[PDB]
Amino acid sequence: APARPAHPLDPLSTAEIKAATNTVKSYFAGKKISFNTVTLREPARKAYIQWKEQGGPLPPRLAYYVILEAGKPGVKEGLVDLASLSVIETRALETVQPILTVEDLCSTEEVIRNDPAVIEQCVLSGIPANEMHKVYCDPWTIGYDERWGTGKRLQQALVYYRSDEDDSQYSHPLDFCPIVDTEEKKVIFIDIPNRRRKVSKHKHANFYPKHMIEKVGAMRPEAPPINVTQPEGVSFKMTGNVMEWSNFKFHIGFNYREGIVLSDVSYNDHGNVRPIFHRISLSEMIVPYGSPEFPHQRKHALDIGEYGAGYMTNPLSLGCDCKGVIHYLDAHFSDRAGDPITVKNAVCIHEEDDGLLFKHSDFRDNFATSLVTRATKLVVSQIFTAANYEYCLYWVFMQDGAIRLDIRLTGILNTYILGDDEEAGPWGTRVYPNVNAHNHQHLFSLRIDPRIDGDGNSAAACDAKSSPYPLGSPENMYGNAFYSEKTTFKTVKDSLTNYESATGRSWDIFNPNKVNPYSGKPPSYKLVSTQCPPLLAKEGSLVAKRAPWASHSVNVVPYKDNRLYPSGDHVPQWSGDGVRGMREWIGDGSENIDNTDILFFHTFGITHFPAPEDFPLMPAEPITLMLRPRHFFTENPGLDIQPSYAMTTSEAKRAV
Amino acid sequence: APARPAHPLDPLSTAEIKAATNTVKSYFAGKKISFNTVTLREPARKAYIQWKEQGGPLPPRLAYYVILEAGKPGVKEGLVDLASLSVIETRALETVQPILTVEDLCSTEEVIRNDPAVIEQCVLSGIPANEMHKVYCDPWTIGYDERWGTGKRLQQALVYYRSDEDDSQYSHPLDFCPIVDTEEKKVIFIDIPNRRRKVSKHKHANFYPKHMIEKVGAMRPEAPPINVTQPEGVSFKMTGNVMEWSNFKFHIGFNYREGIVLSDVSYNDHGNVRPIFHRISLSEMIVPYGSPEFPHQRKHALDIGEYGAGYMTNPLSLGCDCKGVIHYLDAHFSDRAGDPITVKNAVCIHEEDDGLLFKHSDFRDNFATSLVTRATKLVVSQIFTAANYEYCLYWVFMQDGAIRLDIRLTGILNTYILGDDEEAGPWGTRVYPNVNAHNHQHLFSLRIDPRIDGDGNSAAACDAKSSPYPLGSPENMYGNAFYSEKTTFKTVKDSLTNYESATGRSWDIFNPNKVNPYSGKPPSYKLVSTQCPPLLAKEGSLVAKRAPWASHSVNVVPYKDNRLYPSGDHVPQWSGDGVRGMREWIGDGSENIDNTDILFFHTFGITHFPAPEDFPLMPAEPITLMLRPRHFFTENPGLDIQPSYAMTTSEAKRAV
Ligand SMILES: [Cu+2]
Ligand SMILES: [Cu+2]
């Protein structure tokens, strides 16, 4: 049996992966199978907490697998008990399709380049038959197409042309969309538009230094360096995957889908170690495009569930992606053959300056009496590439006890062809000649499993409101009175809430069993998040049905085990009909969520209307949200940090 | 005559200040006068642009002054022509009161400590008569009190007790409020509550290291250092107050009121130097409190117009407030005697790493084909202290051509006393025993005088909207279609708009005379700003009347000279009645603002519901907004910056 991990939440080692895939091959001996997913099945929440805090049973070390079998529809999935090298649960799911791996994305180009119907369309589009090596595709999942459902595993090949291998292809989309059976390795259909648009004759819109020298004359000279050193080392301590820093303690996990998973998050409040979150991660996304024209409705990528923030994560880049003194973690997955694969340097961990933590000075001696303390932040990060997009993910811990998630979006716009006299608006932007960059949103589902100061939690909306008493009344003489209206969610239905600019809405995750001795309020972490777009696709749309979580900024449901992925476990090609994922968890909306084990799913992101500044490669666009302690502590928790400068009134008088 | 400045927008030198005050003293010879304000009167916008870009006349170098005269109500104000040492304009304003200086804050404590009625109240409150040296006050402007109007110059002494001079006084407010005549140096009234609350007998809530060692046992050890150096110097160049960095060029100005003023802001687009803004600054604030109980309606500080972001600015570190390699500017004002005073190191300028600028990698070779470029940002900052508050102001320029304003709020909560059995809610929070920190908002008025790619500009609201065609229609078959609805403001009235979470509203400031050759849209800078609270005080309230700008997120008016301060030129003790400031500029709402010289005033900020984490000293709370180029450039303007790492497809194949 494989050696068991240092910690029950540690991701599967390479040896554990191989042990799992050997087990599964033996169970299916005589069958031709391929591996889609081999990943840790995390322990039940109860089992973990009981092991960690109550001297309870050691949870079994289990691997979840998804396989395909040649000639069989759908997938099989199950669990392997690693200690006994045995399959302990298995089932066949003939009517779902699974996440697409890097191998799956790389496989489609050879299919389309050799398909006679595709060749014919390249030629009709102005690319000669002997130049197929110049044709490339981003082979998305089909997403959903009602002509096939889940009956075949399908990709849509978004086709482009490169004049030279070093080109950025996105200036030269083609007009047609081959549909490919991923498992049969064949083109089954090609969507061809009513109006044909041949390949752009313009130069490629390129962005490496050699290209830029041709385009603008010269690169800027190298700027003088800004160097960042920690000559006495770092202040954080890692014990395997467990982090300790500035009184925070937590486990850094990682998987094929979510990427970074932070677990067992506590804060050491002068010797009282107080839980905050059991688990926090990104659980799904949707990137819905806004052109109604066929087949563009199929562009609504659920990037986490369809590609994976782990599978697609970048090996980060000795001193370029992450600047400073860095601790790296590697990621391990299975390939289709059942062999472990490694992404080196998938996670970067470091501490960085974060400006001022607090300051106050006294006007009475011209600010001679003064105290200033600088902030340090701890950053746990990854960058994943989902075809054209780059998503830079930064989990940030702060010395006031706040935790923030910062995202920067970069990469390249998804582009489609635009005719010489064709107008892109209102659904997209002409960002370069013959290039239409369609409107789209990027929405994310943050999953919080809280344990604010322990178990038994609730959530609330907090709305700023003027007093209901009018100006000139004895209760509100001058019309200034205002308060925070807290609406505690009692049932699931109550939770289904949007951000509201009219009230500056925030949400509290709180422990109703405890009370701050000063304020009288429950200890809480407050979600402060304003990048909360409405879902623009209509009710009942394909987008709305496949992402039931995205229609509210906040969804709060009862905890149950295995409630991770809110668009279901196998996302590609689901029509959005059925009681699964968030739609299952919400149910009829009547279940209790007050003072219990809850899961808080937050929808946040941006609406992107492309502009030429975004092309050919887009400058980073920031998204953030923060979880802030409010009524958790009885005073500013950073005041024991040594100030950078401190002078008292008495000391200022003595300096004369 | 004083030597003329290097640049017409340079603030008055110390010699110019003295020259101006000598001129005014001579004009008023035989009269007993004191100086309130002596500051640059900036050139008219037409005159500046003509001088800068058209070989036009050199604008006269002018000083604006505000003086008080013993025995005369209100103020006198006027202009001095420095070249001729003469008063060129003067007028008496008998019914206004002016900004309170540092000297004016410092003067009140000696008055109240020696006043028999105040002493009596201290004794009734539990502080013996021989301990008046332990009584302190923050002597705000009265703000507005209908019992006196502007008929006397008045301060309200928010009173506190210190057990030792090194204490933070804010745990020990007293229950009463002396009203002080600033110019007569006497207490004229004391507001006494119906419910007396004697001084707290608790320990002070303190925050220096010596205090914290007593409170929690020990300070944390010094963390290992993070060192930032620039061994080959910085990439920016300053010529006097003119900055050049990453193709931006602008003038760094400073005054008593607004603090930092950025002017003549352009971007050098490969040799084509394109204007962006004529002037950008913070022009006013309001910090309205939410307790209706008398006299707390008088807490609605207009910090900029009542105290001044320049007058109240901190002399910065060095090495503590601003980390790294810093260029500092000093600030110069007049004191009451007409002598120049200096705040050393009032502004800090430096460049800092700002993470990734952009990245893209190709999945086809497992991300071997990759380009990553790191961002640098340029930061122009100050910190001002308005009694209890600290406001950290950062104007940030970025290498994608965006400009951001970042603010961090810190300092100390304003507190009032709380009885042992008194409930603070719903209008405040008990943050420590016997301490009530009332609810309040912090609202700011960002003033933008734009020149987007030159003169003749417009503004618009941009709202994301679903297509009006329903799901299932030929126009919107799958219900996903969406667009940006642009509402161009034709008249002032049209511009009076709020942030709307329902549409993810942004605003464009654009040049309708020009067209992006790719997109077809006008060049613009887009305001991306979501920390846009409603004003919670009711229509017709004292707050809403004194801050007419604050009731909309956006106000756009025609440019005229001297339209700087949207709550009027002399803010303290204005009732809010009258056609002045923003209310004058809005007029009847009918004036054209489409394709003309416009002023864009943006209201943003936060609503603060205190919690114990904020006490006794508050961790920094961030506020931000961004102005982003959209359709300004025809491609990402940063692509000529040398990448940190770049490998092409061909290079990756050659590396084997
Ligand atoms: Cu996008
Ligand atoms: Cu505040």
UniProtKB/Swiss-Prot annotation, chains A, B:
Keywords: Copper, Disulfide bond, Glycoprotein, Manganese, Metal-binding, Oxidoreductase, Peroxisome, TPQ. SUPFAM superfamilies: Amine oxidase catalytic domain, Amine oxidase N-terminal region. GO terms for molecular function: copper ion binding; primary methylamine oxidase activity; quinone binding. InterPro entries: Cu_Am_Ox_Cu-bd, Cu_Am_ox_TPQ-bd, Cu_amine_oxidase, Cu_amine_oxidase_C, Cu_amine_oxidase_C_sf, Cu_amine_oxidase_N-reg, Cu_amine_oxidase_N2, Cu_amine_oxidase_N3. It catalyses: a primary methyl amine + O2 + H2O = an aldehyde + H2O2 + NH4(+). Topaquinone (TPQ) is generated by copper-dependent autoxidation of a specific tyrosyl residue. Cu cation binds at residues 440, 442, 608. Pfam families: Cu_amine_oxid, Cu_amine_oxidN2, Cu_amine_oxidN3. PROSITE patterns: COPPER_AMINE_OXID_1, COPPER_AMINE_OXID_2. This is Peroxisomal primary amine oxidase. It comes from Pichia angusta (Yeast). The gene is AMO.
